[PDB]
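@here heads up, posting the sequence + SMILES for the adenine run so it's all in one place. Ping me if the SMILES looks off, I pulled it from an old spreadsheet.
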Amino acid sequence: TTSTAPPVAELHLHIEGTLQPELIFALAERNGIELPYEDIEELREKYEFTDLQSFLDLYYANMAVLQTEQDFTDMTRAYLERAAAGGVRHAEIMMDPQAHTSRGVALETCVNGVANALATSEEDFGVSTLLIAAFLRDMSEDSALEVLDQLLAMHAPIAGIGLDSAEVGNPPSKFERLYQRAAEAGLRRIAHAGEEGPASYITEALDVLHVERIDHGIRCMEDTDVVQRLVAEQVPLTVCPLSNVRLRAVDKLADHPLPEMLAIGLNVCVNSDDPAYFGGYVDDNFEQLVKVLEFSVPEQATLAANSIRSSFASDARKAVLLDEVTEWVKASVTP
Ligand SMILES: Nc1ncnc2[nH]cnc12
Ligand SMILES: [Zn+2]
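bot reply: prediction finished. Complex structure tokens:
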């Protein structure tokens, strides 16, 4: 038996969702920004969410303290540091370029800020990293295409493209052009689907957008033969247990489909999504899965190895990490 988390890769994580209330107040201070909260207690008080939207509102509001390159670097390093301590061996990190350019902050600023933290991640924290630019699905495709163009032109260190923000009423198909652009640019593809959006949206992301893994995807359980294709094709599903609970997509953690999804062969893995908003990082997600859903060591290991096989890391990086989960299991079961 073990109480430690396994060596994993986090494939579903928003860097802006990594922003802890302490850092928010610190960056506000450094930028001489007045916050709409008397104290940091009044802030934490605002973390009871009702749906995806109520969360996004805070999520976007908090980004206001991110002004300088240093701000982005600091935020990224604070996550890489905490992620490492929690067992994260490889991190594929999302970022919402538009959520900053819409505030007058240059692409140069937000991209450089993060990248500079990432370019040194293996050395400083022992974490392999990929940068994924995610696009706000509730803004136009045309503006997403223009931002993509600028990322390309400036040679931004992005490995792939993502799709998030308010899902319902904003189908994957809306960004077909965008993803055709990305693919011909050699960019890898992921997209949020099946969080609050229907199983239909998953098929759309797979067929119209040609994504390489589905983010969330829990609503796939509503359609037998969508579930069927997922299983058949081993499409990676980046599940976020605590996220789904705190956003009310799932009532209680005890009600989460993850166990069933694993049992039926869906290629699922565990992610913290927006760690500073849902009260826990990946290792916290694991802890709760064990504590509440009685996940075994071998089960946890399976989840870990999925996350590695599903990553866009080198086969070499996967191999050594895979061997690591094998060691963890052997060290972690009762004699
Ligand atoms: N989990 C999530 N779903 C949709 N949009 C998001 N933006 C940040 N995190 C998100
Ligand atoms: Zn997400």
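MO: The two ends are 9 Å apart (CA to CA).
MO: One more: Residues 21 and 40 are 6 Å apart (CA to CA).
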